Amino acid sequence: IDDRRQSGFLPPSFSSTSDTGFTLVTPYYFNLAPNYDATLYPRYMAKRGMMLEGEFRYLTHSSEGIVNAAYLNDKDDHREGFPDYSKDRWLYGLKNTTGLDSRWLAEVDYTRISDPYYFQDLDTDLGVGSTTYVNQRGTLTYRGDTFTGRLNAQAYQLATTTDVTPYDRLPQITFDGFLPYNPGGMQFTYGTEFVRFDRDLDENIYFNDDGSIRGKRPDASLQGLARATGDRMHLEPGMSLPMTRSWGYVTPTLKYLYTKYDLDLDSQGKTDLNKRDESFDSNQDRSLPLVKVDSGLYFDRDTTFAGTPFRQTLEPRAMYLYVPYKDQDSLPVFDTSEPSFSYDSLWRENRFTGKDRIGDANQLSLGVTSRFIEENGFERASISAGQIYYFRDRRVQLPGLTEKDLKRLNLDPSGLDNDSWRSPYAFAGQYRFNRDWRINSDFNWNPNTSRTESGSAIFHYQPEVDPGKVVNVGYRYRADARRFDSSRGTFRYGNENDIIKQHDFSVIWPLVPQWSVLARWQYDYNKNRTLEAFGGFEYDSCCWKLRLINRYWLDVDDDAFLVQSEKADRGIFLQIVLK
Amino acid sequence: NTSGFQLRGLGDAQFALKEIDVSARNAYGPTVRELKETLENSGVKVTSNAPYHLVLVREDNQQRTVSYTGSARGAEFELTNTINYEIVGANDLVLMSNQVQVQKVYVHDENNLIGSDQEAAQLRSEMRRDLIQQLSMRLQALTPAQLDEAQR
Ligand SMILES: CCCCCCCCOCCOCCOCCOCCO
Numbered sequence: 001i002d003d004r005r006q007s008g009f010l011p012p013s014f015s016s017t018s019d020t021g022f023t024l025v026t027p028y029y030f031n032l033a034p035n036y037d038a039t040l041y042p043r044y045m046a047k048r049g050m051m052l053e054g055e056f057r058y059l060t061h062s063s064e065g066i067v068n069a070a071y072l073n074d075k076d077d078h079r080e081g082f083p084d085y086s087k088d089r090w091l092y093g094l095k096n097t098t099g100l101d102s103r104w105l106a107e108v109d110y111t112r113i114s115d116p117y118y119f120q121d122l123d124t125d126l127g128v129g130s131t132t133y134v135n136q137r138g139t140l141t142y143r144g145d146t147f148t149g150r151l152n153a154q155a156y157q158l159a160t161t162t163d164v165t166p167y168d169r170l171p172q173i174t175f176d177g178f179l180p181y182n183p184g185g186m187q188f189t190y191g192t193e194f195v196r197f198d199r200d201l202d203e204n205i206y207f208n209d210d211g212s213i214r215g216k217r218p219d220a221s222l223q224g225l226a227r228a229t230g231d232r233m234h235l236e237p238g239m240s241l242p243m244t245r246s247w248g249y250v251t252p253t254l255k256y257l258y259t260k261y262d263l264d265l266d267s268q269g270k271t272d273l274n275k276r277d278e279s280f281d282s283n284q285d286r287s288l289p290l291v292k293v294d295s296g297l298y299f300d301r302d303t304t305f306a307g308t309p310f311r312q313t314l315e316p317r318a319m320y321l322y323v324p325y326k327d328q329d330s331l332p333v334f335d336t337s338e339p340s341f342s343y344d345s346l347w348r349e350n351r352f353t354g355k356d357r358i359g360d361a362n363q364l365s366l367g368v369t370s371r372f373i374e375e376n377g378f379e380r381a382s383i384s385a386g387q388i389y390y391f392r393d394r395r396v397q398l399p400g401l402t403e404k405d406l407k408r409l410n411l412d413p414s415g416l417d418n419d420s421w422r423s424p425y426a427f428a429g430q431y432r433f434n435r436d437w438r439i440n441s442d443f444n445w446n447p448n449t450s451r452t453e454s455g456s457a458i459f460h461y462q463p464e465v466d467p468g469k470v471v472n473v474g475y476r477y478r479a480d481a482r483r484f485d486s487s488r489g490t491f492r493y494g495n496e497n498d499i500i501k502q503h504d505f506s507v508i509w510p511l512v513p514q515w516s517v518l519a520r521w522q523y524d525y526n527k528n529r530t531l532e533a534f535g536g537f538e539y540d541s542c543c544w545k546l547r548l549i550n551r552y553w554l555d556v557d558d559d560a561f562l563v564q565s566e567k568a569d570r571g572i573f574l575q576i577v578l579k
Numbered sequence: 580n581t582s583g584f585q586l587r588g589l590g591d592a593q594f595a596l597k598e599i600d601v602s603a604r605n606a607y608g609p610t611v612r613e614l615k616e617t618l619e620n621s622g623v624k625v626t627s628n629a630p631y632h633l634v635l636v637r638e639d640n641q642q643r644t645v646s647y648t649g650s651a652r653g654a655e656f657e658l659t660n661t662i663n664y665e666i667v668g669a670n671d672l673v674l675m676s677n678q679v680q681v682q683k684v685y686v687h688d689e690n691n692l693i694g695s696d697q698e699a700a701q702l703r704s705e706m707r708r709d710l711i712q713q714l715s716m717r718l719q720a721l722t723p724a725q726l727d728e729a730q731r
């Protein structure tokens with residue numbers, strides 16, 4: 001038949017959203033494709049002008065990449081008063097990756113937009129959510145058999161006006177390698193890093209005509225070391241000796257972390273705020289030992305469910321972690337984040353990410369994992385349960401989450417205990433099946449505050465290789481999120497505004513032959529508000545395919561007063577397809 | 580003896596196939612390297628000279644938003660790592676083929692992008708080692724008795 005090469009018009013699509021008005025897209029698929037293709041997306045809009053997109057794709061042995069372009073002359077107006085506003089909307093980016101066969105990997109992830117309101121006005125692909133940033137990174141990586149070196153130049157471009165300016169890692173050089181050894185002898189590892197974090201803060205106030213000022217960018221809410229820039233060097237040598245047996249394993253590991261900071265405080269940060277409170281040191285120094293003992297056992301069993309023979313392995317695991325305490329409050333945060341509690345949290349050398357914060361540790365992590373494997377080697381089910389036992393407290397915290405909250409914030413959020421003697425219970429369950437049955441659950445329960453920190457229950461239903469019947473049911477909860485507060489310039493635990501308790505329903509189901517129903521409903525119980533809800537039909541003829549849906553959804557917005565607002569929209573979407 | 584559980588003994592983690600040519604679309608990378616490493620530590624030597632090859636084609640790292648903030652912005656991201664492997668035998672014949680995947684969720688901060696990237700990186704490492712674990716479990720159950728039975 002061939003006919004993969006539709007070098008003509010692709011089945012168009014219509015959209016009447018009563019906000020964007022009438023919108024007709026008529027794609028053209030350039031099939032210059034022995035291995036690489038091209039596509040043109042000329043979108044006509046009613047409220048806005050005629051626009052065009054260009055998507056080039058290439059896929060070969062040792063190479064992969066997608067180039068994107070887009071232009072629109074803005075017919076729609078009255079987003080004028082909004083700052084950083086442009087009438088010539090454009091987008092151009094390159095997502096490249098070359099040299100998968102060689103030791104020289106050249107990755108590229110660049111994307112430049114014209115204005116922060118590009119995705120809030122033109123983007124419909126990512127419907128429910130909308131990206132608040134785009135990647136501007138370029139990575140070169142050498143990868144020897146014994147070591148790995150990487151030069152990375154990564155930055156971010158804000159697709160919004162209500163978030164702080166992201167830091168730049170203009171030259172991040174990492175050298176992580178190991179050392180050749182013989183079975184029974186010691187194993188040596190090393191991780192070196194050098195990053196120059198820089199950032200061009202835009203704290204310039206924006207004006208009106210009579211109202212004078214109407215709002216200032218969030219960057220002007222950063223205080224002191226929050227405005228810090230500069231370089232950081234990290235040296236991390238380590239040694240490990242894994243005694244492995246057929247029934248168990250014990251692995252001692254001793255590492256040493258040395259970090260040095262060459263900072264700059266841009267004056268306004270240090271001359272005003274610092275001097276108003278404390279002193280500033282551009283030359284910073286940190287050196288810690290680290291002890292980690294990882295033990296584990298292996299049990300086996302023979303079961304038979306529904307005639308199918310399964311191997312139920314029981315895997316108990318213990319891990320002691322010791323890191324002495326050092327005051328790190330004088331350090332700024334560049335690449336450090338503190339992930340919420342889970343089962344994986346039990347087996348990490350540091351409760352923080354990045355290198356700006358090294359968690360003071362003296363813990364005994366106890367866990368267990370029972371998994372069911374069918375004799376073709378396939379993992380069908382998995383259950384994990386664990387808890388950490390603290391012998392000391394957790395004094396090293398993010399800016400605003402340490403005893404800063406006691407003084408300069410007078411706050412004490414509910415569910416925050418860093419002085420208790422134990423962690424929440426962590427449960428991670430998973431039940432799978434190849435004909436796309438998939439239920440995944442996660443639950444974290446703090447016994448001290450007697451509160452649920454995190455919850456998750458995801459379910460994906462499919463039948464006997466029939467792609468017509470799909471049923472997705474998801475429930476999510478989150479109240480222990482540690483995020484940077486734009487309005488406070490520091491970190492914050494469990495933001496009342498951003499607490500997650502949402503459900504996501506989805507379904508495609510056959511009614512009568514050639515006909516099927518499509519539906520989805522996302523709902524936030526915290527706001528008691530529906531995020532997204534659409535429903536419609538799919539007529540599957542012998543010749544053509546017609547999909548029609550009525551859709552309601554919330555989109556991100558940042559008004560002229562620079563506050564995060566959510567704004568909804570309802571519309572009809574129609575699409576034709578030949579396959 | 581009430582349960583039926585008892586410690587694992589050599590005969591279980593014996594690994595039937597003691598040699599196989601492990602290759603990947605990403606010839607030099609963390610996945611394939613740590614894979615060959617784990618296999619060698621398990622007792623299986625890796626060499627290009629082999630009638631049986633384990634080929635990793637198309638390793639995919641996808642990401643989607645799974646929860647939203649109070650301002651309808653991304654709150655939690657779900658990373659899904661998926662590796663498509665095929666076992667090849669004599670004369671470049673695909674003896675068998677399947678996929679192995681895993682997924683995890685992390686909290687994304689719109690005001691701390693680099694920290695979130697670091698968290699995502701660590702998560703990707705853990706997921707990587709999990710996928711390698713699964714591939715190990717799958718390769719252990721293999722037997723040299725399973726032939727090509729090619730027919731055309
Ligand atoms: C791939 C490295 C890019 C990182 C440079 C830092 C960019 C951070 O600021 C982004 C916004 O500034 C506009 C960018 O300037 C023009 C970019 O186009 C030139 C191509 O390099």
Ligand SMILES: CCCCCCCCOCCOCCOCCOCCO
Pocket residue numbers: 190192235236237256258287
């Ligand atoms: C002079 C070392 C500081 C305190 C003595 C501790 C003795 C054991 O620790 C030695 C590790 O000290 C870190 C050395 O600085 C990094 C150099 O090694 C990194 C390799 O690139």
Ligand SMILES: CCCCCCCCOCCOCCOCCOCCO
Pocket residue numbers: 291322362391
């Ligand atoms: C086992 C729970 C308490 C252990 C905390 C370690 C510090 C106090 O113990 C010191 C005596 O133990 C001998 C070495 O301890 C382990 C190594 O880490 C301590 C650094 O000297």
Ligand SMILES: CCCCCCCCOCCOCCOCCOCCO
Pocket residue numbers: 505506507519520521523528
């Ligand atoms: C004032 C009215 C209350 C606001 C709506 C809150 C409703 C939240 O609970 C709904 C639970 O009902 C589940 C029924 O499922 C029907 C949806 O499933 C169809 C899939 O699209």
Ligand SMILES: CCCCCCCCOCCOCCOCCOCCO
Pocket residue numbers: 519520521530533534535552
């Ligand atoms: C859409 C699939 C069919 C399932 C029915 C769910 C309908 C939910 O979408 C309603 C969209 O309307 C938005 C208004 O949100 C509810 C407002 O009323 C609640 C009163 O507080």
Ligand SMILES: CCCCCCCCOCCOCCOCCOCCO
Pocket residue numbers: 016017018517519533534535536537549550551552570571572
């Ligand atoms: C211009 C659109 C105005 C209509 C308001 C949108 C209301 C939000 O609900 C959309 C989905 O609600 C169910 C409507 O279903 C469409 C018909 O298909 C029903 C079969 O499920």
